[PDB]
């Protein structure tokens, strides 16, 4: 199995053994320390947990439980320690989504993103971006329906599209600390999946996030449409001949 961030995890590092929940991040392209949701299979990543401190460049190993009844391979993970600090700088992505209300040529209103003009004028000048890849900017809150706003774009966006704002929101791990004192007897935290089967809870699954097989109908466009006065005033050699 691969292993989810926030899940319990028992670490063998230094003399101690201790059960914690880690926070997995990558170092985006050495920029911003982005919190993963799963550990990258066959790839190194950065974890961050809360417990005993060790001088760096120390090896360690790692497990999900000490069950003899594990069918196979009770060890799970390994690596070295990189660094220690207080209050790491973890970030996770946040997508603030609207949907266009009307669409003029460039400037598009966008409605279902905000709950107040206050929130908007905080996000004044906001770097907004439709899915299709048109960039753009949020410029003023729109007044009459509270929570709609004005944005200026790079072409004609479409009512089909979804307006997304990219933002970066910090996370901090939790400060749980189990010293997995085996001999005295001790409480291990359980994993989310067996938790769900125990408390009889289905795993959350989104119709909107499960991948789908898209039909692309082959786009054609309308023919060129040229105005009355233009076909009037132009010179003979290039006038349009229509029957």
């Amino acid at each position: 199995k691969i292993l989810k961030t926030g899940d319990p995890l028992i670490f063998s590092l230094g003399w101690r053994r201790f059960q914690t929940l880690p926070i997995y991040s990558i170092w985006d392209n050495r920029t911003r320390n982005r919190m993963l949701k799963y550990t990258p299979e066959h790839m190194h990543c950065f974890g961050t947990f809360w417990g005993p401190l060790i001088a760096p460049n120390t090896s360690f190993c790692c497990f999900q439980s000490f069950s003899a009844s594990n069918p196979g391979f009770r060890i799970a993970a390994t690596g070295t320690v990189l660094s220690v600090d207080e209050s790491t700088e973890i970030v996770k992505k946040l997508k603030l989504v609207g949907t266009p209300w009307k669409i003029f040529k460039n400037t598009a209103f966008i409605k279902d993103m905000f709950n107040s003009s206050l929130e908007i004028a905080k996000f004044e000048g906001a770097a907004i971006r439709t899915v299709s890849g048109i960039r753009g900017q949020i410029k003023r809150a729109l007044s009459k329906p509270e929570g709609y706003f004005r944005a200026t774009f790079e072409d004609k966006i479409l009512l089909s599209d979804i307006v997304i704002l990219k933002a970066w929101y910090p996370v901090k791990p939790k400060q749980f600390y189990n010293p997995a004192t085996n001999l005295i007897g001790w409480q291990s935290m359980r994993l989310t999946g067996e938790i769900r089967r125990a408390e009889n809870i289905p795993t959350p699954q989104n119709p909107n996030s499960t991948y789908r097989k898209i039909e692309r109908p082959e786009r054609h466009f309308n023919p060129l449409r040229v105005p009355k006065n233009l076909a009037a005033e132009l010179p003979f050699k290039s006038q349009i001949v229509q029957t």
Partner: protein
């Protein structure tokens, strides 16, 4: 909270060792005798301010009395743009308030010894009203040049390269109105961190002291004065040594907020003597009395005599830098550090450092003759955080 201390002596030393150990401590009875101004001193509280600034994750509380404090050390990190500051090369600001009498070096030497044990660099910028740069009469605090060329070569001995050791002044200053005042700004870029410094063996005799250099500073007065100081000091020393060489430097004035006002007027002189053997250096300083107006020739004679006394007295390292080099040798690796000290050079301060290290729990010092060879056993901790790539 867990370890406890008493009194007000070696405040910075106890503090910086608590930082270096992560031992949460609690000190009581700073100024119990003084009913006038009990509790903290302002340089101390600015010192606590600076410590909290430079570090991260540390917790410090001071009593309603102000006379008992308790401190949970976090980590030595340095000029970090995530938490502390804006950029990598961003400099962290520090003001110290106007009612400071004590020394910049009295701020520096704890900072100087702690900072090679950070994760990233150090970019301190001392401004404020109470930024004196000169020596104090005071607790006879050091001056900037003395501090620089007197203790930083020792970090060069310890393994920390002066190539990336960086201290520069922009304005210098004396006391001015009483001991309080200041005005000279300084900034320091400790750009060299190490895993563990080199455990050192200063045991050979520093017999032939080769030369003497030094620096006369004058802040607000004519350069004729420091010229006269060179004349006075060379009149003292030329019966001993040919190569005595003292640069002179004049600063117009520092100006301080009240509208601004000129302060920091005075002058003083630093003497360093250089032994042919290895990096063995003997320093002293003398500063004019902040309201006195005594003759700069007498100051030259006095500083000369002080240098000669440390020549007579010091085995290899002088008493002023003794706590530094001892603490670094302590924070050196789990081996023997072998220093050659002199018998007169021992101070109650050095003994207090011994006592408080023993309270901290690192290993001890063995003392045999040769002057006295002291040896320490390093606790080999070093810096705690470092992005080992």
């Amino acid at each position: 909270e867990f370890l406890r201390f008493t009194g007000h002596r070696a405040f910075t030393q106890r503090l910086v060792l608590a930082t270096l150990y992560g031992r949460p401590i609690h000190i009581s009875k700073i100024r119990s005798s003084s009913a006038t101004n009990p509790g903290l001193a302002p340089h101390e509280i600015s010192f606590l301010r600076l410590l909290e600034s430079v570090t991260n994750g540390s917790i410090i509380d001071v009593s309603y009395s102000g006379t008992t404090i308790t401190y949970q050390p976090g980590l030595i990190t340095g000029t970090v743009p995530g938490m502390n500051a804006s950029l990598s090369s961003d400099a962290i600001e520090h003001v110290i308030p106007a009612t400071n009498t004590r020394g910049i070096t009295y701020f520096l030497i704890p900072l100087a010894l702690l900072a090679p044990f950070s994760k990233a660099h150090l970019n301190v910028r001392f401004t404020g009203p109470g930024v004196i740069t000169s020596a104090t009469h005071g607790a006879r605090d050091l001056s900037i040049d003395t501090f620089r060329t007197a203790v930083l070569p020792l970090y060069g001995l310890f393994g920390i390269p002066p190539a990336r050791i960086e201290l520069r002044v922009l304005q210098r200053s004396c006391a001015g109105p009483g001991g309080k005042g200041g005005g000279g700004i300084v900034e320091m870029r400790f750009a060299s961190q190490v895993r563990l410094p080199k455990t050192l063996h200063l045991n050979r005799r520093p017999g032939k002291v080769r030369r003497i250099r030094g620096v006369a500073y004058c802040t607000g007065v004519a350069a004729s004065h420091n010229n006269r100081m060179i004349t006075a000091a060379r009149g003292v020393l030329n019966q001993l040594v040919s190569d005595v060489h003292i640069a002179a430097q004049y600063d117009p004035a520092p100006l301080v907020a009240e509208q601004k006002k000129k302060t920091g007027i005075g002058f003083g002189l630093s003497l360093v003597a250089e032994t042919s053997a290895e990096g063995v250096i003997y320093a002293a300083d003398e500063v004019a009395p902040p309201e006195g107006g005594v003759v700069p020739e007498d100051i030259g004679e006095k500083c000369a005599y002080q240098l000669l006394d440390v020549i007579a007295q010091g085995g290899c390292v002088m008493a002023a830098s003794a706590p530094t080099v001892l603490t670094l040798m302590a924070m050196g690796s789990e081996d023997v550090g072998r220093l050659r000290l002199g018998r007169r050079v021992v101070s109650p301060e050095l003994l207090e450092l011994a006592r408080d290290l023993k309270a901290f729990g690192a290993a001890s010092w063995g003392i045999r003759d040769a002057d006295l060879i002291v040896s320490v056993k390093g606790t080999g901790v070093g810096n705690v955080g470092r992005k080992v790539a």
